[PDB]
Amino acid sequence: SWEVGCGAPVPLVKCDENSPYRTITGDCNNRRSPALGAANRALARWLPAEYEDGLALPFGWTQRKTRNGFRVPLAREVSNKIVGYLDEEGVLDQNRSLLFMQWGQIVDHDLDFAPETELGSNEHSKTQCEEYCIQGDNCFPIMFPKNDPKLKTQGKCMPFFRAGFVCPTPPYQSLAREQINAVTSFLDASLVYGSEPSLASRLRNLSSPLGLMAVNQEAWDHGLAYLPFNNKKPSPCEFINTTARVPCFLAGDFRASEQILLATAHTLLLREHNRLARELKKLNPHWNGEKLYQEARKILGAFIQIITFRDYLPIVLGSEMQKWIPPYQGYNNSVDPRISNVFTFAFRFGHMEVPSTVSRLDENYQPWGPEAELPLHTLFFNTWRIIKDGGIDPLVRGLLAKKSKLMNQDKMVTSELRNKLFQPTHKIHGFDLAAINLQRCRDHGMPGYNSWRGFCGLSQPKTLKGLQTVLKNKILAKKLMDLYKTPDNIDIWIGGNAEPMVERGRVGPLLACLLGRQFQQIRDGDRFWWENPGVFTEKQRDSLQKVSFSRLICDNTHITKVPLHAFQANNYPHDFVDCSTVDKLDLSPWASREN
Ligand code: HEM
Numbered sequence: 001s002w003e004v005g006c007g008a009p010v011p012l013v014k015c016d017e018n019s020p021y022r023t024i025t026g027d028c029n030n031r032r033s034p035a036l037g038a039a040n041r042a043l044a045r046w047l048p049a050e051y052e053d054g055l056a057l058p059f060g061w062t063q064r065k066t067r068n069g070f071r072v073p074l075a076r077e078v079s080n081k082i083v084g085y086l087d088e089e090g091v092l093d094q095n096r097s098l099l100f101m102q103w104g105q106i107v108d109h110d111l112d113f114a115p116e117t118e119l120g121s122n123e124h125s126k127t128q129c130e131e132y133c134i135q136g137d138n139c140f141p142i143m144f145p146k147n148d149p150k151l152k153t154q155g156k157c158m159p160f161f162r163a164g165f166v167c168p169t170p171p172y173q174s175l176a177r178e179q180i181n182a183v184t185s186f187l188d189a190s191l192v193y194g195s196e197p198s199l200a201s202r203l204r205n206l207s208s209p210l211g212l213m214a215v216n217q218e219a220w221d222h223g224l225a226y227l228p229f230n231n232k233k234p235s236p237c238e239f240i241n242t243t244a245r246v247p248c249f250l251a252g253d254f255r256a257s258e259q260i261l262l263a264t265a266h267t268l269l270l271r272e273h274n275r276l277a278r279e280l281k282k283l284n285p286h287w288n289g290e291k292l293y294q295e296a297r298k299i300l301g302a303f304i305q306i307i308t309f310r311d312y313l314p315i316v317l318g319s320e321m322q323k324w325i326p327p328y329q330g331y332n333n334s335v336d337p338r339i340s341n342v343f344t345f346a347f348r349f350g351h352m353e354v355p356s357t358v359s360r361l362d363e364n365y366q367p368w369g370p371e372a373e374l375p376l377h378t379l380f381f382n383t384w385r386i387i388k389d390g391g392i393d394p395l396v397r398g399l400l401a402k403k404s405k406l407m408n409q410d411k412m413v414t415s416e417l418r419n420k421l422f423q424p425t426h427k428i429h430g431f432d433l434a435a436i437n438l439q440r441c442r443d444h445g446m447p448g449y450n451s452w453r454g455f456c457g458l459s460q461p462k463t464l465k466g467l468q469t470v471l472k473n474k475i476l477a478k479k480l481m482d483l484y485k486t487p488d489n490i491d492i493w494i495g496g497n498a499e500p501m502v503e504r505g506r507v508g509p510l511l512a513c514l515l516g517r518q519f520q521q522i523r524d525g526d527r528f529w530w531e532n533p534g535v536f537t538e539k540q541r542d543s544l545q546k547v548s549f550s551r552l553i554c555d556n557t558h559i560t561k562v563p564l565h566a567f568q569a570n571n572y573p574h575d576f577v578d579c580s581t582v583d584k585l586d587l588s589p590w591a592s593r594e595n
Pocket residue numbers: 101102103104105108112113114115258259343344345347348349350351353354376380417433436437440
């Protein structure tokens with residue numbers, strides 16, 4: 001066994017039993033073991049961590065040491081050989097809107113974050129890793145293979161630092177290293193409100209007693225709000241353009257400004273919250289600040305649950321959706337709602353769905369201006385193209401009228417992310433999201449592909465012919481084999497994503513199984529699930545049953561023409577209808593008859 005509960009960083013676990021609202025930290029959801037699904041605790045291990053030394057080291061740390069008799073391939077070599085492609089033609093998913101990709105990143109953020117090791121204060125370590133590419137302690141550089149273009153213009157490696165782990169920040173033994181999930185495992189709208197009280201309050205507007213979320217005072221969007229700027233220096237949003245000097249936004253989740261479209265979706269959320277607190281004020285004028293905030297927060301987290309589970313998940317899982325997420329049967333206190341470590345990798349499937357460009361569209365959904373279509377890499381940490389360039393309404397149109405990239409066996413990840421990714425405190429648009437993912441798998445001591453195949457009640461190929469038959473691809477199988485030398489060594493991220501898509505779905509069997517379980521666990525282990533009897537009133541539930549993303553757009557943007565089904569591909573003007581004919585969220589069921 002292990003020390004039953006290592007817990008030096010998490011002390012305070014005091015719970016109010018009457019409380020009708022979720023805590024910001026996730027704590028007190030589970031009564032028998034409150035810390036389940038709470039921010040700042042270890043990610044769950046569905047299977048024992050697999051580490052080079054069986055403690056904290058990652059495979060590929062010691063050159064001599066092999067995994068199952070073979071050396072594991074360099075993350076970047078796998079990337080170049082398998083992940084990359086040149087031709088962006090015929091790569092768009094015909095039946096998925098770009099919103100599909102976007103919602104997947106939103107939901108993912110709400111659920112898990114495993115941030116890097118924070119051990120360098122007035123230290124050159126972030127630069128000693130980057131400048132001289134020397135692996136040590138938390139620094140775990142992604143080295144370039146022999147034939148690599150980036151070797152010629154960038155250096156010997158790409159900087160990479162290991163993720164944070166519970167108890168000691170830098171040293172520990174002998175139990176296996178466990179990474180931290182810095183957000184709440186629950187689909188609770190954390191990304192809008194925060195997972196810490198320190199952040200939660202800063203995000204709030206406590207000046208007025210209207211329970212509104214703090215907005216921007218330096219800029220507006222045709223009378224509509226923008227999230228507040230985060231005034232911390234240095235900002236990468238200012239670094240990308242030093243002339244525009246527009247900093248990153250401040251949201252409930254740290255990563256909000258990574259790409260313009262996510263920041264965009266973050267802006268749509270804050271608005272719907274403020275819009276909700278204003279309607280509650282009008283029907284319940286006796287309700288105070290905190291109460292207006294909490295009830296609005298309660299409704300938004302319910303909205304994210306319905307969209308994700310009713311509209312989003314069935315089109316990710318497709319045929320495999322009932323097999324894993326059968327109709328709700330109520331809260332089950334024995335269900336672990338913690339995000340597992342492997343899900344933070346299973347969910348990365350979304351990377352394949354990211355297209356190489358983003359567009360801006362006018363009322364007739366036509367190119368908005370001369371540069372309307374821009375390359376994705378010019379949008380990493382770019383908040384200025386929203387403030388100084390037309391607001392969100394044009395971007396929210398792109399999201400409805402354009403397509404997500406379709407995952408493709410010979411075209412998995414676009415170069416915008418493969419070669420051109422920007423990372424804070426590193427200057428260049430010259431990083432690789434694919435290499436990073438694979439590096440992270442090893443950093444998190446991930447079990448190989450077959451361990452996971454076995455875990456899901458699926459076959460475990462040991463030959464080239466076996467792998468060919470599972471992937472339904474000769475050449476993909478051969479490249480993987482030549483690199484890994486065995487399936488048993490294939491990193492889960494590239495292994496799960498290499499499998500053909502399930503019928504009516506956008507992922508393979510292995511991912512549909514992993515994604516499948518996790519989502520059902522976060523629905524069943526949630527005491528505050530919107531459908532759990534007693535959370536909302538019988539009537540409130542009938543009002544919430546009508547929410548839509550279309551409605552979220554109409555309610556919080558000046559667009560008046562939207563599809564009925566926001567995630568499927570939709571063309572203008574045919575697939576578009578007026579906002580007038582769209583179900584509204586009636587808030588009458590929230591009337592507080594106190595007298
Ligand atoms: C830029 C990036 C994106 C869009 C242009 C993007 C998009 C997605 C989608 C669509 C996802 C799911 C449907 C998704 C999931 C997860 N991501 Fe990814 N993402 C961009 C960039 C990054 C970067 C950089 C990281 C950090 C990777 C690391 O190991 O350091 C990243 C991570 C993740 C992630 C793991 C979250 C966690 O638990 O830490 C997903 C589950 N994304 N992204």
